[PDB]
Curated annotation (Swiss-Prot), chain A:
UniProt protein name: Large ribosomal subunit protein bL9m
Gene of this entry: MRPL9
A single GO molecular function term of this UniProt record: structural constituent of ribosome
Oligomer and partners: Component of the mitochondrial large ribosomal subunit (mt-LSU). Mature mammalian 55S mitochondrial ribosomes consist of a small (28S) and a large (39S) subunit. The 28S small subunit contains a 12S ribosomal RNA (12S mt-rRNA) and 30 different proteins. The 39S large subunit contains a 16S rRNA (16S mt-rRNA), a copy of mitochondrial valine transfer RNA (mt-tRNA(Val)), which plays an integral structural role, and 52 different proteins.
Whole-protein residues included: 53 to 254 of 267
Record keywords, A-Z: Mitochondrion, Ribonucleoprotein, Ribosomal protein, Transit peptide
Subcellular location: Mitochondrion
GO biological process, one term: mitochondrial translation
Organism in which the protein naturally occurs: Homo sapiens
Swiss-Prot record, chain B:
The entry's keywords: Mitochondrion, Ribonucleoprotein, Ribosomal protein, Transit peptide
Alphabetized Pfam families for the sequence: Ribosomal_L33 (PF00471)
Known partners and oligomeric status: Component of the mitochondrial large ribosomal subunit (mt-LSU). Mature mammalian 55S mitochondrial ribosomes consist of a small (28S) and a large (39S) subunit. The 28S small subunit contains a 12S ribosomal RNA (12S mt-rRNA) and 30 different proteins. The 39S large subunit contains a 16S rRNA (16S mt-rRNA), a copy of mitochondrial valine transfer RNA (mt-tRNA(Val)), which plays an integral structural role, and 52 different proteins.
Organism taxonomic ancestry: Eukaryota, Metazoa, Chordata, Craniata, Vertebrata
UniProt protein name: Large ribosomal subunit protein bL33m
From Swiss-Prot, chain C:
Name of this protein: Large ribosomal subunit protein bL28m
Subunit structure of this chain's protein: Component of the mitochondrial large ribosomal subunit (mt-LSU). Mature mammalian 55S mitochondrial ribosomes consist of a small (28S) and a large (39S) subunit. The 28S small subunit contains a 12S ribosomal RNA (12S mt-rRNA) and 30 different proteins. The 39S large subunit contains a 16S rRNA (16S mt-rRNA), a copy of mitochondrial valine transfer RNA (mt-tRNA(Val)), which plays an integral structural role, and 52 different proteins. Interacts with OXA1L.
Expression (tissue specificity): Found in a variety of normal tissues including spleen, testes, thymus, liver, kidney, brain, adrenal, lung and retinal tissue.
Protein origin, superkingdom: Eukaryota
Organism of origin: Homo sapiens
The family this protein is said to belong to: Belongs to the bacterial ribosomal protein bL28 family.
Subcellular location(s) of the protein: Mitochondrion
UniProt miscellaneous comment: Potentially represents an important therapeutic reagent for HLA-A24 patients. This antigen is recognized by tumor-infiltrating lymphocyte (TIL) 1290 in the context of HLA-A24.
Swiss-Prot record, chain D:
Organism of origin: Homo sapiens (Human)
Section of the entire sequence shown: 61 to 312 of 325
Quaternary assembly: Component of the mitochondrial large ribosomal subunit (mt-LSU). Mature mammalian 55S mitochondrial ribosomes consist of a small (28S) and a large (39S) subunit. The 28S small subunit contains a 12S ribosomal RNA (12S mt-rRNA) and 30 different proteins. The 39S large subunit contains a 16S rRNA (16S mt-rRNA), a copy of mitochondrial valine transfer RNA (mt-tRNA(Val)), which plays an integral structural role, and 52 different proteins.
Lineage: Eukaryota, Metazoa, Chordata, Craniata, Vertebrata
Protein name, per record: Large ribosomal subunit protein uL1m
Entry's localization field: Mitochondrion
Protein keywords: Mitochondrion, Ribonucleoprotein, Ribosomal protein, Transit peptide
Listed GO CC annotations: mitochondrial inner membrane; mitochondrial large ribosomal subunit; mitochondrion
Family, similarity comment: Belongs to the universal ribosomal protein uL1 family.
Keyword field contains Ligase: no
One of the record's GO molecular function terms: RNA binding
Superkingdom of the organism of origin: Eukaryota
GO terms (BP aspect): mitochondrial translation
Principal place of residence: mitochondrion
Amino acid sequence: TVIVERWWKVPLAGEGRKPRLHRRHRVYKLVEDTKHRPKENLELILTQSVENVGVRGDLVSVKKSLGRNRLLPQGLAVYASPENKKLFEEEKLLRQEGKLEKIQTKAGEATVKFLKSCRLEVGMKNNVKWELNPEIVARHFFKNLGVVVAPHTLKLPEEPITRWGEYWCEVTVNGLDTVRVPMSVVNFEKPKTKRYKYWLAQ
Amino acid sequence: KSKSKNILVRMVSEAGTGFCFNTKRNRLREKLTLLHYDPVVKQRVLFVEKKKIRSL
Amino acid sequence: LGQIYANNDKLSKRLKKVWKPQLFEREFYSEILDKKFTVTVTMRTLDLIDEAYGLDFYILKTPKEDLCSKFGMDLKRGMLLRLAR
Amino acid sequence: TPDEKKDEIEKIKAYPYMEGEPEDDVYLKRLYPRQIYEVEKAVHLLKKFQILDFTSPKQSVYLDLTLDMALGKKKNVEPFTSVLSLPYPFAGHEIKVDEERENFLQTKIATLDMSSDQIAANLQAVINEVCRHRPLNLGPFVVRAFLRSSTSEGLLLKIDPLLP
RNA sequence: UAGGGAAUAGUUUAAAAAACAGCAGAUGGAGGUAUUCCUCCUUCCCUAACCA
RNA sequence: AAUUUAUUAAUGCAAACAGUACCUAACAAACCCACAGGUCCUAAACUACCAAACCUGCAUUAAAAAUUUCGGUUGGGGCGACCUCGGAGCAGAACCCAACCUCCGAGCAGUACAUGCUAAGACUUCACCAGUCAAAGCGAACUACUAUACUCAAUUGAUCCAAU
RNA sequence: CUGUUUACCAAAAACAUCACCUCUAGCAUCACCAGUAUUAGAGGCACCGCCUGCCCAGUGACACAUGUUUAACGGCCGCGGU
RNA sequence: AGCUACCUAAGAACAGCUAAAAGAGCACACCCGUCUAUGUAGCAAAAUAGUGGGAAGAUUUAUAGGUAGAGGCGACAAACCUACCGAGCCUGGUGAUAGCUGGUUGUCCAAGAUAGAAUCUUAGUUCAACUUUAAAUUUGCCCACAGAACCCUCUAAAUCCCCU
RNA sequence: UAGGGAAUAGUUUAAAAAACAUCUGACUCAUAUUCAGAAGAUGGAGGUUCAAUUCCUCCUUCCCUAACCA
Ligand SMILES: [K+]
Ligand SMILES: [K+]
Ligand SMILES: [K+]
Ligand SMILES: [K+]
Ligand SMILES: [K+]
Ligand SMILES: [K+]
Ligand SMILES: [Mg+2]
Ligand SMILES: [Mg+2]
Ligand SMILES: [Mg+2]
Ligand SMILES: [Mg+2]
Ligand SMILES: [Mg+2]
Ligand SMILES: [Mg+2]
Ligand SMILES: [Mg+2]
Ligand SMILES: [Mg+2]
Ligand SMILES: [Mg+2]
Ligand SMILES: [Mg+2]
Ligand SMILES: [Mg+2]
Ligand SMILES: [Mg+2]
Ligand SMILES: [Mg+2]
Ligand SMILES: [Mg+2]
Ligand SMILES: [Mg+2]
Ligand SMILES: [Mg+2]
Ligand SMILES: [Mg+2]
Ligand SMILES: [Mg+2]
Ligand SMILES: [Mg+2]
Ligand SMILES: [Mg+2]
Ligand SMILES: [Mg+2]
Ligand SMILES: [Mg+2]
Ligand SMILES: [Mg+2]
Ligand SMILES: [Mg+2]
Ligand SMILES: [Mg+2]
Ligand SMILES: [Mg+2]
Ligand SMILES: [Mg+2]
């Protein structure tokens, strides 16, 4: 919106009277064009689960283009009005204590989707005798797949692994969803050697 | 117009009174320090050149 | 529709100047009317609709002198008639 | 202040960081900022990694320090080598400088078997040692600090308390 | 005029060396704790002025 | 010629508008490991690209135009010359006195740093504006300085406005 | 060359003109055009015949790394002696 | 745009002779308007008489339509756009403005002529000067001595001041 | 009649230097070319400045421009 102001002073009209406008009062100067202002975010309450924005009941501040052109038209979000805030607030109490089941957080769904379609390369050194335990296996998620896994969540095949081979790790994300990832135990190769060996070669 | 010899400078009192007076000096000479009467303190005090006002 | 001084200096020429709003064609949905409308709007209109929490609230809340639209006033009558009946 | 050098200093300051593990038990590293801080915990953790990733009990802790070695004035300070022995010299030690002059200094601190307290003391000595080049309060001299073993990733220490 | 920046042998560069010009040759000048820290002045550049 | 780019066209930015990808140069000197490879002497940190047009706003450059003006003196006008200030003759002796009359100059410089303040009475370029000289007094200097409104002929520019 | 012009003081050597040349444009549903570079438009010059020499420093235009371009605006020399 | 410039739609006219091909020649109708005289409030706000250019073509012409003044149209004559186009006409703004010219209406008496300054000013203004009216109270004019410069060639006629 | 510009060695230029011409030598059988040497100048007059081609002024010679409107 163009905001303008007059160069020339308008004389006071007084109570109950209209200002007397000379032709000189049509000369304007541009105070501000509000399209160039820094953009502010739109506060919405999510109804379904969006891939990156959040999960149902989460107050999300999104770009006005995203909320207006995608979430609100498609029903993915609703306005964070006093009424809508109360409706969703009541639901969050029932989920915590009532019959309504608890649901993954925004990050939890992202990890589950990644954990559904990923394979862990648990590189183990040949020289030293090694036994695979939740703590050691947990370390490899961080290094290889980039997932930060709590040691307790991991459930190993429960058969001691001391030989290169294939097994299965059952990961539980936040205690609700249990994912079984393929496990590929391989001879450990240092980062520099592995990248030069294959990534550079091919 | 092109010719240029002297300059006008502001001499400021060293007494802290803020009293100033303008004097003419040669452009190629060193900054002036003068003993001049300061009305605020009502006696002659040292004045030191601070700024050049214009070219004379 | 107004005038400006060139280079914002009153001692310069006075020129005619028209400032036009940036217009956008957008689709809106009315809950009371259960219909979608393709309306040409401004970014201010979108902001006002967001502050009202929907098109229906904006149409019903906004007085005639602020709507500045015959189409908007017809939507108001439509929504009000459905609520009244 | 060349744009690139100063802009990176602004950018590196921008990198987010957080305190404490997030609520989620299992979370992708990308989804949350850097977390592990305390210098004591960091040394203890680096020992933990050594056990999990089978490697030598004694390893060189190559602390890399992103020390604002520039922006004293709009004129930037220059790289020198203030040499001082640490309280417990590992089995004077030179504070070498970057070749690209991006302000990161690779300076070994201690062997992995060195006790956390001794490594912590070795850390503090370097903090004063590095600021020796520009120990002015005019321009902040330290931004980030990554305590990495030879065969481990760098950990973002909470160096702010130890700076002065 | 305003600030910003700059000044090495006659000339142009380097960290007291080479190259050209004609074995000579230099750290614009002054002051202070030394081309390399700071300050004032000269010359020049840059950028913006030069309205009334 | 001065002023201007509203308008038209181009370009830039903002505005508006979808998403596609996230990064590799070892090497054992010693030792281990049947291999394939590992231990030590670092294996960190770190995201890039990126939405064509139309429309709107702000700039820049063009095009094409718009508004307005084109000083005076002058043995007619034009051309040439001249336009303010001071000294001399014309104007012989209080003042004043012209010509595109006769001659010569000025648009500073130098020394001070009380060229500080204040105040009777006067002069005055024929108006006004501006300009000029000053006792006493205050404060200084001073009992060696033709010391007290500096030498000097002209040596110069109103109001508004701008800088501070 | 036929033609054209100042109706009402100029009919001409002025304009147009066949011809020659320069410039711009790779394309469709209202001119150009229901056309498509042997085309269309913007100009110069003035059939034909012999010709149209030198110059891109300046201005303009074009082009970008220098630069290119006069049938674009235009220009195309002295002084002394034998 | 009933004139005229150019254009659009659909019409019309062009004998005779030569050549038979023609923006070809001679020459009617027809179009134009070279030269001379006449005419000049005329027959005519552009004509008449004779003489001339063209006359199958870029020809002439009837009808309806189109382009409109910051414009149109133009084989550029600054042509033509309703008798007067360097840009039409009408109405309105409008009682435009004019330092310029012209004009300014009964009787009678009285006082009344003039240094200069500034000015895009020298065809005008404003300030001085002069002039007019009313009022105040006190000298005005004419002038005796004495008095007002040296430098420099006219040792000028005079002036200034001034009681009586 | 009015206005602007110019004057440098014998010649033509430069900001007191080059080029030739002139004179001297060498090379050639001799001449030229060439090589090595040498000399020579700030139109005139007046003035400022310690110092004036380089700051001004008048004159001479020459060049260029203008000399119109009814
Ligand atoms: K006369
Ligand atoms: K004719
Ligand atoms: K050219
Ligand atoms: K018509
Ligand atoms: K008259
Ligand atoms: K006048
Ligand atoms: Mg003028
Ligand atoms: Mg005149
Ligand atoms: Mg005359
Ligand atoms: Mg003249
Ligand atoms: Mg007077
Ligand atoms: Mg006194
Ligand atoms: Mg005629
Ligand atoms: Mg005709
Ligand atoms: Mg005729
Ligand atoms: Mg012709
Ligand atoms: Mg020809
Ligand atoms: Mg030619
Ligand atoms: Mg002869
Ligand atoms: Mg017609
Ligand atoms: Mg037709
Ligand atoms: Mg016939
Ligand atoms: Mg014929
Ligand atoms: Mg014929
Ligand atoms: Mg015609
Ligand atoms: Mg003509
Ligand atoms: Mg003409
Ligand atoms: Mg008419
Ligand atoms: Mg009148
Ligand atoms: Mg009388
Ligand atoms: Mg004036
Ligand atoms: Mg007069
Ligand atoms: Mg008397």
